[PDB]
Copies of this chain bind each other. A is one copy, B any other.
Amino acid sequence: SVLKAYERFTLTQELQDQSEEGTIPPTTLKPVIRVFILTSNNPELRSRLLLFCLRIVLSNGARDSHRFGALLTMFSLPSATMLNHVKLADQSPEADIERVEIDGFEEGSFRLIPNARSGMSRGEINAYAALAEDLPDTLNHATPFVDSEVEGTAWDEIETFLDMCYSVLMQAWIVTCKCMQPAASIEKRLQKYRQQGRINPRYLLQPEARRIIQNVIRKGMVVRHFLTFELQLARAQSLVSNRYYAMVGDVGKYIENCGMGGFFLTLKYALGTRWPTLALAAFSGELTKLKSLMALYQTLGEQARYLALLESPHLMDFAAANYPLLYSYAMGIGYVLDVNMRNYAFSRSYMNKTYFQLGMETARKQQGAVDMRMAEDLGLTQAERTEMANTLAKL
Question: Which residues from chain A sit less than 8 Å from chain B, CB to CB?
Answer: 1-3, 5-6, 9, 12-13, 16-17, 20-31, 41, 46, 63-65, 78-81, 84-85, 91-94, 157-159, 161-162, 179, 195-197, 218-219, 221, 225, 228, 233-246, 249-250, 252-253, 267-268, 271-288, 290-291, 294-295, 297-298, 300-304, 306-307, 310-317, 324-325, 337-340, 349-350, 352, 354, 357-358, 361-362, 365-375, 378-380, 384-385, 388, 391-392, 394-395
A226 to chain B, nearest CB (A): 11
Given pairs A26-B245, A27-B80, A283-B371, 12 additional interface contacts (CB within 8 A)? A3-B271, A6-B272, A23-B238, A28-B79, A29-B161, A93-B238, A93-B240, A239-B304, A239-B306, A282-B367, A287-B374, A325-B337
CB <8 Å contact, B281 and A369: yes
For A5, A92, A368, the residue with the greatest tally of chain B CB atoms inside 10 Å of its CB is: A5
In the bound assembly, the distance between CA atoms of A370 and B80 in angstroms comes to 61
Name the B residues within 8 Å of A79 (CB-CB): 26-29
Q: With contacts A31-B158, A94-B242, A282-B273 known, is A372 near B378, CB below 8 A?
A: yes
Q: Is B358's CB under 8 angstroms from A395's CB?
A: yes
Closest partner residue, chain B, to A233 (CB atom): B26
Kindly state the separation between the CA atoms of A296 and B385 in the bound complex, as whole angstroms: 33
Question: A273 contacts which chain B residues (CB < 8 A)?
Answer: 281-282, 284-285
Q: Which residues of B contact A325 (CB under 8 A)?
A: 337
Which B residues touch A388, using CB under 8 A? Answer: 276-277, 279-280
Query: Does B361 lie within 8 Å of A246, measured CB to CB?
Result: no
Choose among B290, B307, B324, B395 the residue that contacts A239 (Cβ–Cβ < 8 A).
B307
Contacts A5-B294, A281-B370 known; A313 to B358 CB distance under 8 Å?
A: no
10 contacts between A and B (CB under 8 A): A5-B295, A16-B298, A28-B78, A28-B243, A221-B246, A239-B310, A240-B310, A280-B388, A358-B391, A358-B395
Interface of A is mostly: helix
Alpha-carbon distance between A379 and B274 when the two chains are bound, in angstroms? 11
Docked pose: A238 CA to B249 CA in angstroms: 24
- Tell me if B78 and A236 are in contact (CB < 8 A): no
A239 touches B285 (CB 8 A): no
Residue on B nearest A179 in the bound complex, by CB? B195
**Which residues of the partner chain B approach A268 to less than 8 Å between Cβ atoms?**
285
From B12, B243, B313, contact of A253 by CB (8 A): B313
For A372, give its contact among B29, B233, B379 (CB under 8 Å): B379
A140 to B114, CA, bound (A): 50
| Contact (Cβ within 8 A) A25 B241 | yes
Give chain B residues whose Cβ lies under 8 Å from the Cβ of A324. Answer: 338
